[model samples]
Target: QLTEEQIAEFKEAFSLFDKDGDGTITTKELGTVMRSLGQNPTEAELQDMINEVDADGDGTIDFPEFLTMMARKMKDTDSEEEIREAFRVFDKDGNGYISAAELRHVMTNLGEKLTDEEVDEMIREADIDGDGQVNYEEFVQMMTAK
Candidate 1:
């Protein structure tokens, strides 16, 4: 729940990533932004950011999506609650963990359309505990681990 001023600030901040002035940010732009912030996120990392923030599943983040993501980052929140909120977006079954199926479902919805192998690779990359599914802590790490 952000005020109008906060939304405006997000819009202003997002302008940097709207490289084409088309009012949308692509994964490429995101990669550039991350690099500018002194974080060298890989292609997979950039895609993961898009998958998390792209709410309308349009394959690119528009102003509203960018604003929401910025808000999420700016607000001081309980780490556990933030993790839970983020997890719920992909945890369609409310299972408290994100399975490969869940990741695939949301990835498709986010317009990425990953193959099962790709999805498996993502899970394997983030599955720090060797579990097949991504737990809350692991999900948080993926989302914030720049």
Candidate 2:
């Protein structure tokens, strides 16, 4: 169930997609909205997404249908709480960052025994600023990256 605040947020987003002030979101509107959000979805992908939530078999999404899609997507993604918990595991010293030493320790002790090169590779992937450490934002990006 969505809270009042969540519903309001979704309503605002829905209105953004309903460009002509229509109560439903058509494929063209969805495509425009997605592109504005930096996604380059093909027409077929947009139609597929609409079809997934178009409960009435119409080629558009109403508010209820939009909410259904949002709810499912919310469940599919990891929450900040979960991401923070994972961050804490790596940031054992509570220094707001994961050091090379800490990462090496965790990888060797908790999971498979990774070589020093493997550990450094992992750090390089998430250390956006080349600071030799993984900060919270970097960790979140690594966790959510496709």
Candidate 3:
């Protein structure tokens, strides 16, 4: 778990990436910062960053966006923390569960125009252990596991 100070520093450090004042950051801004840091991204690489970072159609990102993605892509899927982070990210409204619209919102951000069946499968994957609905805890746990 990140210490309170670490979290605060993350906010402090990354706030510069928020290109717009909409309380969210975007890849364009992040890319600019990366370039300044001598870690510049090529256009294609930057597009991949966009694919990974932007979680809303508004072309904005937040800390949760990048953190959750890192958790998801981590090869060692044994840490419950990772999955919980992902679940918390998707359940943006602090609701205990994600509704269909929330699901659609996440899928759209992934650049996936999923068909009905694909959506169902994804939902099934999320609702681990055969639960009917994806409560926040359950979803996060799945993100933690393989």
Candidate 4:
């Protein structure tokens, strides 16, 4: 359940998206809000978001629906602490970084076997500094790359 403070914050955010002072948020408004926040959501993606939360069968999201959406979205993503814990598992040696060898060992032994080349590619995705290793920050960025 959301605390009063959380609900107030959501209400403020909802008002920001409901730009016309209307009680509902249109797809256009949603798109604008997302893009302003550096997201490049497509028209279809925006519609899909509205469709998932527009419980009234209308073409827009009302405040209650918006709350529902926020709750679900919040539940779907991991917190920074959780992400750090996952990174620790991959780091193995507590060296504060993940080497290609470490990544390969975990992937091949834990889940489906991955070839060396595949493992290197996975490392490349999060090895932003080209050091061939993933630091805590890099790992966090990859996990939350949404």
Candidate 5:
């Protein structure tokens, strides 16, 4: 079980998508953030995600709405899956792989801009082996029980 601090972190993560401060998040906002993280989401897929999380008819997403999801992701959960499942448009090149440049752009667009060094840290954390690059499998590994 996650500690209270860990749960708080999870909620903070969820807040990134819940833009507009209405206690709800839209797929557009969530997908845009996911794209920054290197996942791809499509309209229909985004709808699926929203349908799965946005239980209230507000067409916006809330905490419980989203938790019902992260809780179901199982031990193999990867935040990137949500991006891949819901926001394909932001996957600009459509090359099936999200580049670091795209990640930077998305973060900048989201108003929580990060320095290149910060971005480097992110990719570095994801890279795990210090090889300085992340393929999909490498990307998925960290989220799993390694």
Candidate 6:
């Protein structure tokens, strides 16, 4: 949750995207921002991003929805214990590392049937040490990386 001051800060950011002083962000504004970041998001990709946080079917993102999206993208400043507990759940079998098999199994069991390639990509991203598995240190760093 955001403090009142923090909310106002986030609202300040929201105003930047809500060009023309509109109360919501249209796809045009989103695309403009994306382009400024050198990201060329397709129409479908833009829609998907909006839909991910859109609480209403109005096809636009209000400040609240923008905050929701930002919250998800923001690095977790949660207690170390909470992050470690989450890692423990993902690192089943009491192993210090999270193997691809374990991750695939957990994700599948949780109703997310990611492809083997997807798991490999995830490992490739987090396994900065070139290991095939994600250790606690790597996991923490990856999760909290800005």
Model 1 weakest lDDT span, ten residues long: 105-114
The ten-residue window of minimal lDDT in model 3 covers 68-77
Better of 1 and 6 by TM-score: 6
Which pairs clash in the backbone of model 5?
A: 25-61, 40-83, 40-84, 41-86, 41-87, 41-88, 42-86, 42-87, 42-88
- Candidate 4 residues lying further than 4 Å off, grouped into runs, are 37-39, 74-146
Clash counts for all predictions? 0, 0, 2, 0, 9, 0
Q: Give one digit per residue, the lDDT tens place, for model 5 in 50-105.
A: 77666566787667656656766764445765556444444556664545666676
Best by TM-score: 5
Q: RMSD to the native, candidate 4?
A: 14.7
Question: Among these predicted structures, which one has the highest lDDT?
Answer: 6
TM-score of every prediction relative to native: 0.46, 0.48, 0.38, 0.47, 0.63, 0.47
For residue 34, what is the lDDT in candidate 3? 57
Q: What does candidate 3's lDDT look like per residue over 1-146, in tens digits?
A: 64677567666555545646567666667677556543545888876767655656456666777566554555444666746655666666667576656766765654348675666667776676645356766655754677
Residue 112, candidate 2: how far off, in angstroms? 47
Name the better of 1 and 3 by TM-score.
Answer: 1
Model 3: CA > 4 A from native: 1-3, 19-21, 55-58, 70-146
Report the CA-based lDDT of candidate 3 relative to the real structure: 0.62
lDDT of prediction 6? 0.74
Runs in model 2 with CA error above 4 Å?
36-39, 75-146
- Candidate 1 residue-wise lDDT, 26-118, digit = tens: 888777755654356677878877998887778898766776666766674546675675567567677777788877766565423579887
lDDT of each: 0.71, 0.73, 0.62, 0.73, 0.66, 0.74
**Looking at model 4, which ten-residue stretch has the lowest summed lDDT?**
105-114
In Å, residue 50's CA in model 3 sits off its true spot by: 2.1
Candidate 4, residues 1-108, lDDT tens digits: the string is: 689998898887766667688888888888786565435778788988788788777887777788887687667964677566556756667777778887776655
